[PDB]
Amino acid sequence: GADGVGNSSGNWHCDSTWMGDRVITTSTRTWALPTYNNHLYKQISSQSGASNDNHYFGYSTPWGYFDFNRFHCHFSPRDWQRLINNNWGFRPKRLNFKLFNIQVKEVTQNDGTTTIANNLTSTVQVFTDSEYQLPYVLGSAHQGCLPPFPADVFMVPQYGYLTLNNGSQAVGRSSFYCLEYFPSQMLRTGNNFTFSYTFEDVPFHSSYAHSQSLDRLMNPLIDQYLYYLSRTNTPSGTTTQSRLQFSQAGASDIRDQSRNWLPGPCYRQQRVSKTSADNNNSEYSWTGATKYHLNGRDSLVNPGPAMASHKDDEEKFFPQSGVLIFGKQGSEKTNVDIEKVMITDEEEIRTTNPVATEQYGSVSTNLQRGNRQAATADVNTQGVLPGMVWQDRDVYLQGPIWAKIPHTDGHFHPSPLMGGFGLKHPPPQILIKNTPVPANPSTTFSAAKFASFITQYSTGQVSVEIEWELQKENSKRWNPEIQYTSNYNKSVNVDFTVDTNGVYSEPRPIGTRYLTRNL
Amino acid sequence: TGQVSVEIEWELQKENSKRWNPEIQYTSNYNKSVNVDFTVDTNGVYSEPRPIGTRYLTRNL
Amino acid sequence: TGQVSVEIEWELQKENSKRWNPEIQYTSNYNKSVNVDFTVDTNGVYSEPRPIGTRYLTRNL
Amino acid sequence: GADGVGNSSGNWHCDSTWMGDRVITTSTRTWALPTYNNHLYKQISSQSGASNDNHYFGYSTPWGYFDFNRFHCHFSPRDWQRLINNNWGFRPKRLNFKLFNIQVKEVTQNDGTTTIANNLTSTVQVFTDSEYQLPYVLGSAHQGCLPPFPADVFMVPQYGYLTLNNGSQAVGRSSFYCLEYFPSQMLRTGNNFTFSYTFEDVPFHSSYAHSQSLDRLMNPLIDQYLYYLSRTNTPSGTTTQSRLQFSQAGASDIRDQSRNWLPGPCYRQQRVSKTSADNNNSEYSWTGATKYHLNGRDSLVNPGPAMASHKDDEEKFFPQSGVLIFGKQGSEKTNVDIEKVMITDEEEIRTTNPVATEQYGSVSTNLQRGNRQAATADVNTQGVLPGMVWQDRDVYLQGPIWAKIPHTDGHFHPSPLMGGFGLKHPPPQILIKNTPVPANPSTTFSAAKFASFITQYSTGQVSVEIEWELQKENSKRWNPEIQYTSNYNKSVNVDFTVDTNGVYSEPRPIGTRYLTRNL
């Protein structure tokens, strides 16, 4: 804190710089914090009637929180293009955070019109846990981000959490956390708040696409010295007899060649098309879904393991849940049409990961003999076999930056499914509250709890700064790369700009992988 | 109106005992229930279900 | 015949938790019984009544 | 431990010395230790049918223990007479303990006659808890002391303990202690054991008797200046009228004088006589007893609070349980006659403590008025009132030296009831065991527990040394004191000596208080 009431508690840093190695990003927004719940905790549970897998049990706090998990908070559409076109990889070294210029207003509903006036003595209290002692809500891809466009004002979302349940009823192991029981900093008008954070080592995200499929690793000019079994039986006469022949695989085959590697694992998806006439007429939405079954209830697998989507020369098809889906500007919550959503497309992983809608391969069912013919079956699911390789999912732009690895005895490879950077100790949650002000107590002592409070809210500015490390590309490719370009044709509205009514919108998803590497 | 803060320092006396079999302890019931004990209800009212005394661990006379 | 002695050093990891309501603990039943649990009987035969697992205290995932 | 098998592990000190301030005592005995229970713990409970107050629940260990709680262990009859006749008080400063010359024998029952031979490789294991973590059995006045006469050999008693019960069944709070779970020292033939101990401060025991009763503190020659109400009404005529007169109390009254002090508290006893013809014909033994009621069961109060016994010029009477009772040489356990027991007599406390068989005093029941006459009742019980004084019970000779104060939130005036010195940290228990030797296991692995062991026992010598502090008397009394004297008349046998068959016996109890002090 500092001097106040007529002295600002901070300026607007809010700039982007590029040092040739690392990137430094800063952004600033204006927020408004309501009082939630009327200053009291409440338990919340699902409805009486409900599906067995829709039940939940939890609590809802008066507190509220700041979250920037999304890139578009930290990157303009232009700054996003120094990154993509010019770089193979990037990772989040370090960040910095602060709040300033806090001011608290009180409102009076007298008569039919409200009035709003400053309360200079009121306070706001803020803390960051940083010991990871609370349930961690971030990384679930909720709403309430800092707006992508710097001039908008946003509303701070409410905080809540869930724990173990049986039906709609709690179990004995379920925990209840009172946020009032942490140390926090009470900020009056002239006071300000700061903290800084340091990311743990994490591998770079890969913004390259491969220039070679795992099918073809070799030169067609030269034959292998290994043999495979080419032909099972021979035409000895008008009737064939069994004779085993062997061959060496050259450029005329290439399906029969020996290899050191296999594609990544798969957990299979249903296929649907964007053309409405193609798809079947029924509800398969839930029945045809791919699911995992945990403790007697089923849960859809929305992102799934990373897989190529539409195969080759079919754009029309995408896996049912297998991809991320973003909404356009101003889309309603429920039952919205096809042209309102923006469906992501991942074709860049064809070279390693298998297509989401097709089988991994085929495997031999039985042992052949003289009188019993061979047979085989398609394998729809694979775990990880020694000697396989894969890629991860794009981070895109408006998608999530990081997620927290659960605390467990084992985990295989941590990278999270939606995208981005798995962290064992991610950026800590920041929680904020309006301190309650009692209103006009009775003259005689009571001992009952106060039901009456002054109605008030607060507002101010918030600033975030992150340092990013870059991985440059060095490549001998002769011919030019594919780049991200805005169309040069004329239009009614420019892309990624405000319209005539002052509404900022994002036309399309933008993925991170354009530049090409060889496998 | 305003805020008030209290801090107290307490001294502890540890137990050293050769008893072979296990002690009686204070435990919250593991069975399911509509409301958890020592927590707020659906209307936001905090309550204490039962009195809790201090003497569980055993000494020999 | 003779005697044998074994000594092991164990390292512990303490819990730090903000949970408001009390944990589930392992407790021996306070009701009366013919024999105490985890003790010798009238013929001098030591027995273990039930398996005891290690995980009671709770963490958040 | 030390060199062994042909070298002794210790000598016999065993002597008494007097330095003019403190006394130093040493004694040595020979012991024999059997194996108990066949090397295994057992729970023990009362019988199925039994009185509600006779139930118990506990355990019996293979271990056994050394106890000297009794003076006659540490004092001959002559050494006991420097103490009594020459001293006002004594207390136990310090002690020292050791075991030596351990030897272990194994016995073979083959045919109809046993043979006994050395086992040189066998061991004995001994420990002292000293942290007071076990149930403390000592101070309950059990048998198994070191013999009073140095030439006898004694048998080491078995150890056991009790805990909470409900009926004959255990409760959940009852504890089970395995003595194998303490550190102990394993002693082979040439090895020896030692430890020393230091008593905490304790007030001297009082071996004086008072030369003044609390009745008479004053000189008869002079009158008091205080007044009391001598006479309630006056003979105004043939009929008396009420007039209050007052008087000063001189030597002709002395019952009416003012005093600063009161006698000690009382909890009353029934009276019986040594003459058989006097007592009533019935069983009042249990019904006429004085008892305390704890948790729904009744327990006799055997010693009771310290009180004078037979009043004055009645020797014939003694309180029912109110006194200690010792048996003569070779008395049977149950239903023994009057002349076999030795009943102690405490008359020396008349001057302060009230007689055990009579009331403390009388107290006014009601408020008088014109038409209602005064009334009063006898008070059979008193707690402690401010400004009272009392004395404690004699320690005698063959009675117990000390006891352990229970560990509790409060206790009033710790001195124990049987007699002697209450200690918060008394001398620790010493526990001893024969290490088990397996016998001839089967050739094929079993995993069952061994039921078969070599039959063997051990023996050796034990030595105890205690330092005592003395409090000398300084008195101006002109005429000679009462002393303890052995009768000079001829007799068949001398007192406190062996008989013609070699049996040592103690003729009478000997208390500690002879020399006189003024109150």
mmCIF file of N, CA and C in Angstrom, chain C residues 1 3 28-36 38-46, chain D residues 40-43 57 59 123 166 169-172 174 176 186 435-438 449:
data_model
loop_
_atom_site.group_PDB
_atom_site.id
_atom_site.type_symbol
_atom_site.label_atom_id
_atom_site.label_comp_id
_atom_site.label_asym_id
_atom_site.label_seq_id
_atom_site.Cartn_x
_atom_site.Cartn_y
_atom_site.Cartn_z
ATOM 1 N N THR C 1 20.578 -72.156 18.408
ATOM 2 C CA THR C 1 19.589 -71.135 18.715
ATOM 3 C C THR C 1 20.292 -69.879 19.206
ATOM 4 N N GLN C 3 19.574 -65.158 19.518
ATOM 5 C CA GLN C 3 18.735 -63.983 19.332
ATOM 6 C C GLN C 3 19.173 -63.175 18.119
ATOM 7 N N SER C 28 -10.069 -47.851 18.021
ATOM 8 C CA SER C 28 -10.558 -49.090 18.597
ATOM 9 C C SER C 28 -11.896 -48.852 19.289
ATOM 10 N N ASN C 29 -12.804 -49.807 19.122
ATOM 11 C CA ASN C 29 -14.165 -49.684 19.626
ATOM 12 C C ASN C 29 -14.126 -49.578 21.145
ATOM 13 N N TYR C 30 -15.000 -48.743 21.707
ATOM 14 C CA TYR C 30 -14.994 -48.474 23.140
ATOM 15 C C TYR C 30 -15.933 -49.398 23.903
ATOM 16 N N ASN C 31 -16.683 -50.229 23.189
ATOM 17 C CA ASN C 31 -17.636 -51.116 23.832
ATOM 18 C C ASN C 31 -16.913 -52.252 24.545
ATOM 19 N N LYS C 32 -17.601 -52.858 25.507
ATOM 20 C CA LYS C 32 -17.012 -53.962 26.247
ATOM 21 C C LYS C 32 -16.966 -55.220 25.388
ATOM 22 N N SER C 33 -16.047 -56.114 25.739
ATOM 23 C CA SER C 33 -15.843 -57.330 24.966
ATOM 24 C C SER C 33 -15.211 -58.387 25.854
ATOM 25 N N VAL C 34 -15.281 -59.634 25.389
ATOM 26 C CA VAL C 34 -14.638 -60.731 26.106
ATOM 27 C C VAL C 34 -13.124 -60.598 26.025
ATOM 28 N N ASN C 35 -12.611 -60.261 24.847
ATOM 29 C CA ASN C 35 -11.182 -60.118 24.620
ATOM 30 C C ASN C 35 -10.895 -58.757 24.010
ATOM 31 N N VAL C 36 -9.769 -58.178 24.379
ATOM 32 C CA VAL C 36 -9.326 -56.933 23.767
ATOM 33 C C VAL C 36 -8.706 -57.248 22.414
ATOM 34 N N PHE C 38 -6.021 -57.140 19.411
ATOM 35 C CA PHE C 38 -4.559 -57.097 19.327
ATOM 36 C C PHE C 38 -3.898 -57.388 20.672
ATOM 37 N N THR C 39 -4.413 -58.379 21.395
ATOM 38 C CA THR C 39 -3.813 -58.797 22.653
ATOM 39 C C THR C 39 -3.918 -60.309 22.779
ATOM 40 N N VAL C 40 -3.203 -60.861 23.761
ATOM 41 C CA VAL C 40 -3.265 -62.297 24.007
ATOM 42 C C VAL C 40 -4.629 -62.676 24.574
ATOM 43 N N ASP C 41 -5.008 -63.931 24.360
ATOM 44 C CA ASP C 41 -6.227 -64.476 24.935
ATOM 45 C C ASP C 41 -5.914 -65.160 26.263
ATOM 46 N N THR C 42 -6.886 -65.902 26.786
ATOM 47 C CA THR C 42 -6.710 -66.597 28.052
ATOM 48 C C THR C 42 -5.722 -67.757 27.963
ATOM 49 N N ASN C 43 -5.472 -68.292 26.769
ATOM 50 C CA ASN C 43 -4.494 -69.355 26.573
ATOM 51 C C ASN C 43 -3.133 -68.840 26.140
ATOM 52 N N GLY C 44 -2.966 -67.531 26.017
ATOM 53 C CA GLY C 44 -1.702 -66.975 25.581
ATOM 54 C C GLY C 44 -1.443 -67.054 24.097
ATOM 55 N N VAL C 45 -2.448 -66.780 23.276
ATOM 56 C CA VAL C 45 -2.312 -66.810 21.830
ATOM 57 C C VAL C 45 -2.572 -65.406 21.311
ATOM 58 N N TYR C 46 -1.551 -64.796 20.722
ATOM 59 C CA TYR C 46 -1.671 -63.461 20.161
ATOM 60 C C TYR C 46 -2.304 -63.522 18.781
ATOM 61 N N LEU D 40 4.912 -67.390 28.485
ATOM 62 C CA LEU D 40 3.869 -66.733 27.715
ATOM 63 C C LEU D 40 2.934 -65.933 28.609
ATOM 64 N N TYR D 41 2.420 -64.837 28.060
ATOM 65 C CA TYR D 41 1.441 -64.002 28.730
ATOM 66 C C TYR D 41 0.084 -64.691 28.748
ATOM 67 N N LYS D 42 -0.734 -64.335 29.732
ATOM 68 C CA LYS D 42 -2.107 -64.815 29.801
ATOM 69 C C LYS D 42 -2.978 -63.714 30.377
ATOM 70 N N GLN D 43 -4.177 -63.543 29.824
ATOM 71 C CA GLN D 43 -5.126 -62.670 30.484
ATOM 72 C C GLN D 43 -5.782 -63.460 31.598
ATOM 73 N N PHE D 57 -10.054 -57.631 35.922
ATOM 74 C CA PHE D 57 -9.558 -58.017 34.609
ATOM 75 C C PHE D 57 -8.099 -57.610 34.508
ATOM 76 N N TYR D 59 -3.726 -59.145 33.384
ATOM 77 C CA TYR D 59 -2.778 -60.015 32.710
ATOM 78 C C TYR D 59 -1.733 -60.511 33.697
ATOM 79 N N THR D 123 21.242 -67.472 29.503
ATOM 80 C CA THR D 123 21.269 -66.078 29.913
ATOM 81 C C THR D 123 20.056 -65.737 30.763
ATOM 82 N N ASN D 166 -15.452 -54.177 32.963
ATOM 83 C CA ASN D 166 -16.891 -54.057 33.145
ATOM 84 C C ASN D 166 -17.390 -55.468 33.396
ATOM 85 N N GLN D 169 -15.584 -58.534 31.985
ATOM 86 C CA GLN D 169 -15.194 -58.239 30.618
ATOM 87 C C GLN D 169 -14.420 -56.933 30.563
ATOM 88 N N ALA D 170 -13.492 -56.859 29.620
ATOM 89 C CA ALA D 170 -12.685 -55.669 29.428
ATOM 90 C C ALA D 170 -13.506 -54.549 28.810
ATOM 91 N N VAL D 171 -13.008 -53.328 28.973
ATOM 92 C CA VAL D 171 -13.578 -52.156 28.324
ATOM 93 C C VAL D 171 -12.626 -51.803 27.187
ATOM 94 N N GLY D 172 -12.955 -50.785 26.391
ATOM 95 C CA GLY D 172 -12.091 -50.406 25.291
ATOM 96 C C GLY D 172 -10.859 -49.631 25.692
ATOM 97 N N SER D 174 -8.910 -50.330 28.288
ATOM 98 C CA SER D 174 -7.942 -51.153 28.992
ATOM 99 C C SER D 174 -6.696 -51.362 28.143
ATOM 100 N N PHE D 176 -2.751 -53.124 27.393
ATOM 101 C CA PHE D 176 -1.963 -54.343 27.454
ATOM 102 C C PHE D 176 -0.504 -54.000 27.229
ATOM 103 N N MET D 186 20.966 -58.525 28.860
ATOM 104 C CA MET D 186 21.025 -59.978 28.928
ATOM 105 C C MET D 186 22.311 -60.389 29.630
ATOM 106 N N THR D 435 15.651 -66.353 29.915
ATOM 107 C CA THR D 435 15.532 -66.374 28.465
ATOM 108 C C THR D 435 15.122 -67.766 27.993
ATOM 109 N N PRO D 436 14.139 -67.884 27.105
ATOM 110 C CA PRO D 436 13.690 -69.213 26.682
ATOM 111 C C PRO D 436 14.699 -69.897 25.779
ATOM 112 N N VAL D 437 14.830 -71.206 25.959
ATOM 113 C CA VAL D 437 15.696 -72.050 25.150
ATOM 114 C C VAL D 437 14.823 -73.054 24.406
ATOM 115 N N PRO D 438 14.763 -73.014 23.079
ATOM 116 C CA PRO D 438 14.002 -74.026 22.348
ATOM 117 C C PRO D 438 14.610 -75.404 22.523
ATOM 118 N N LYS D 449 4.112 -71.964 16.410
ATOM 119 C CA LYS D 449 4.873 -71.464 17.543
ATOM 120 C C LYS D 449 5.348 -72.617 18.421
#
